[PDB]
A paper describes a structure:
Tpx constitutes part of the bacterial defence system against reactive oxygen species (ROS) and, correspondingly, is upregulated when E. coli is exposed to oxidative stress. Atypical 2-Cys peroxiredoxins are functionally monomeric, in contrast to the typical peroxiredoxins, i.e. the resolving (Cr) and the peroxidasic (Cp) cysteines (C61 and C95, respectively in the case of Tpx) are situated on the same subunit. Tpx contains three cysteine residues, two of which (C61and C95) form the redox active disulphide bond. ypTpx has a regular thioredoxin-like fold: a seven-stranded β-sheet, with β2 and β6 running anti-parallel to the rest, although with an inserted N-terminal β-hairpin (βN1-βN2) absent from other peroxierdoxins.
Crystal form 2, diffracting to 2.35 Å, comprises a single subunit in the asymmetric unit, the complete dimer being made up by symmetry operators. As there are only minor differences between the two reduced structures, with an r.m.s.d. of 0.4 Å over 160 Cα, only the highest resolution structure (space group P21) will be discussed here. There are no salt bridges or covalent bonds between the two dimers in the reduced structure. The partial unfolding of α1 opens a cleft in Tpx formed between the loops connecting β1 and α1, α3 and β6, and β7 and α5 on subunit A and connecting β1 and β2, and β4 and α2 on subunit B. When in the reduced state, C61 is orientated into the pocket where it is available for oxidation by H2O2 or alkyl peroxides. During transition to the reduced form, the loop containing G59 to C61 folds into the binding pocket predicted to accommodate the compound. Collectively, these conformational changes reduce the overall volume of the binding pocket and are predicted to affect the binding of ME0052 to the reduced state of ypTpx by inducing steric clashes. In fact, MOE Dock as not able to find a suitable docking pose for the reduced state of ypTpx, presumably because the binding site is occluded by the folded extension of the α1 helix in the reduced state.
Numbering used by the authors:
A (entry chain A), B (entry chain A): 0 to 164
């Protein structure tokens, strides 16, 4: 039972686990897709992966996340972009349908919530408890950590560029 | 570990627990409000309560639920209307903010998920597992079951009228 600290503006909030880091093999995961089927990391073997994991789409900076990676997703090579969060799929799906965002794939923790502590992502205290923290993780075709970032203030977006492989 | 069966159109789906029924005292509960504070049934002592519990706002017939009870909520006496679901609050709050729906109170299972099996409400199998079933329950100022309905096909709305005290 490790922790990490992130911040709401300033402000300490405990986040269970530790985020997988460069070198590490990322644990497999199963999460819920727009048509309510279960989908596993293992189904993207040999494609690279960006995991953009955020408190809630439906929340300002998280929404920006999703637009940007969707737009950045066309200009990309043998890679899927998984937008992973606490939201239910239905909200994930209305957001993307209203914004005409077709590149990205939405995954809900509706099922598979263990993914949160498996990826050092569960918020355990404060008004945010029950939500994933903001973080991006990038993996290869064999689920190895090519990149990973745990954002320090949740307010601010990730760094997309920078680091990109 | 009891079950009940409800249906998606036709189709059997297991729902953990049993819904509290006339006579029964309804278990207290804590769920999450729009400002991310935790709120307990105990905070509405001496007001009567309608609990409209539905798979997802953001879903067709569930949305109709919320509009209707909001409109039916003005024409009502010493009663709060709690719109309780699987959704995160942020979605609950965007729905109501976009529809100008101010009467109702939104409660998320983001925290307090035990409420699902405590109120015979957890869906345990199929693509819906992790969501609450559709049901309405009405209580007095002392959390006694004045009315309660578990909907048989999730497709169809509840019966609002009918039964109303």
């Amino acid at each position: 039972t490790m922790t990490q600290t992130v911040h709401f503006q300033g402000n300490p909030v405990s986040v269970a686990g530790k985020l997988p880091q460069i070198g590490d093999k990322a644990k497999d995961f199963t999460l819920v897709a727009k048509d309510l089927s279960d989908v596993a990391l293992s189904s993207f073997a040999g494609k690279r992966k960006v995991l953009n994991i955020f408190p809630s789409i439906d929340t300002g900076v998280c929404a920006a996340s999703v637009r940007k990676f969707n737009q950045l997703a066309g200009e990309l090579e043998n890679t899927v972009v998984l937008c992973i969060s606490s939201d239910l799929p239905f909200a994930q799906s209305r957001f993307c349908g209203a914004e005409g965002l077709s590149n990205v794939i939405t995954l809900s923790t509706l099922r598979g919530a263990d993914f949160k502590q498996a990826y050092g992502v569960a918020i355990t205290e404060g008004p945010l408890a029950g939500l994933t923290a903001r973080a991006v993780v990038v993996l290869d075709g064999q689920d190895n950590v090519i990149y990973s970032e745990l954002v320090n203030e949740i307010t601010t977006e990730p760094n997309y560029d920078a680091a990109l492989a």
